[PDB]
Amino acid sequence: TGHPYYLRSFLVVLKTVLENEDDMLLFDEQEKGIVTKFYQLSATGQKLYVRLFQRKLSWIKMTKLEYEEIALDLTPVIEELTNAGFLQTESELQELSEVLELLSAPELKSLAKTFHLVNPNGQKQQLVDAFLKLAKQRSVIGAVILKRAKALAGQSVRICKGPRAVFSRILLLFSLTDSMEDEDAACGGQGQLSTVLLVNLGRMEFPSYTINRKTHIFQDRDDLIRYAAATHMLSDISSAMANGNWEEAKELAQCAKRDWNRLKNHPSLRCHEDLPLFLRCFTVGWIYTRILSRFVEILQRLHMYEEAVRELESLLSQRIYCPDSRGRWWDRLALNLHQHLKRLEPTIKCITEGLADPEVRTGHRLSLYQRAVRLRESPSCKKFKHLFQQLPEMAVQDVKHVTITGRLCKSVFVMVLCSVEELALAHYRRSGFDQGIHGEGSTFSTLYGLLLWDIIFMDGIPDVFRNACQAFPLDLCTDSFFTSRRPALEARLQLIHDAPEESLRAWVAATWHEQEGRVASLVSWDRFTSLQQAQDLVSCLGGPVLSGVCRHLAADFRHCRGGLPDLVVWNSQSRHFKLVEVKGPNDRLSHKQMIWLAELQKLGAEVEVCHVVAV
């Protein structure tokens, strides 16, 4: 008796966002009516709207619409939607380019024929450039082309962009808490649900926690609209870059740079600046800064390094937005000054201020440190003593390396075809470790989530849980996660350190039994093949190791989540384990990886780098 998957999900999105009065303040009466109009539709009207909401925004020939699960004849349904203001008809189709677009290339030929002034052959794009040229000069003949084009195209529908824009903004608000937020969304088509959410949201069961909110994110409807707009801008700039369209990207960035300067002094920014970091990420400012970051990337790719440096300096000169990015910025400033602008004095000042910055961390911190020693210990630099300046000797302990071979066929090897990691897994099986998981950071991260679940979903921290569909407290990736739960963390971390390998087995099984399936960002239910396999692994790893790992992930998940080895292997009977990073022929350790290995060693654990050489 249920709705189809896509309608359930879409329904869960609206429900979630509607139950917040905070959030509905950011919609006017007109806009809210659109939501009611939607609920007012029939099950069929609702189904059809969502289908088309999920598809690209443009005209669709009536003969290209078919959803048998909806209705064998869609016209009463289209009618309902056109009545309610959601859909529109070939009647409202008025722009020429649009009608030309909706026509098949054959149909564009026929229309090229029954119009004498046209050269009947050429690509679909060609004919269109032509027909549009024609109508721009001799306008009245253009109206005739339009008329016949339309009649040729037949009956058509298109989603109405006004009601659609409302749902985008509803989807956006749903997604600061869930969707887009868990690594920002591509959001093509104008703002649909992600495939994953569309398919699963309706079925997802979330962890239980208590919604408690005390602070507004957006000033008013206008604020939310400015944000939305920055979001769309950023997404486009990203997409440009993803497609190697750097000149386009540049222009957009520049344009976005101006807008953000036009918004300076605006009263809303006063309140934004005053939000806690875990909220401040949801402000126009944050998003523009994020844009300004892509801008340096863009400049750098166009080898415009002087400019890149200027932007980097701007970025670094403020502490309001994206403090987590400073490590990357500093590192990047340094690299540019050193390698491209070849300017060794500032390179040193840069490195020093960088290292003096409590915001730079793990990977980038190390990368800046290494740059300092490479420099201070160099001839063409020796003409100074400004890098002897009390640099903490932050060395990283070396780790046992090893090598194996595998016949080479993402590099695929033949053993059956397999990855570099699978090849190592094989080696470690013949080396006596009957068990193994290739899970990089998710193995540790799901252990951490299993062991600290109840702390992670703890009550008592205002603003971290704003609605029903979160898979994590909003501060999880903030310095504040730890600090806002200091007593409880220190407790549990300690209890883990001291725990016997049966305490661990039991704790894990507690969470597993009460939460299995519940959606939480740290935990992958399928990561371990069973609860027993999770139990075996915590027995081998033991209290002191697990405790150290959890401390890192809870102190600074943001800068620690990356770098954990590819592999965890263990011998069933000896209980001896090994944490292994697999490196194929052409890759070395990243800074994050070396920091993690040293740290795992310190916690007393067998860590190995395993290089595969190919035949």
Add this chain to the structure above:
DNA sequence: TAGCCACGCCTAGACTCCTC
């Protein structure tokens, strides 16, 4: 005879968009 042309049919491969 080889070698050049003219003409139209048919489809592989790419591409877009959609689906779960």
Add this chain to the structure above:
DNA sequence: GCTGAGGAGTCT
């Protein structure tokens, strides 16, 4: 240069 896989309809 990737972060989903596969199918259908289209274009040329």
Add this chain to the structure above:
DNA sequence: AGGCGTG
């Protein structure tokens, strides 16, 4: 678009 037959 471009391979292919056909005449």
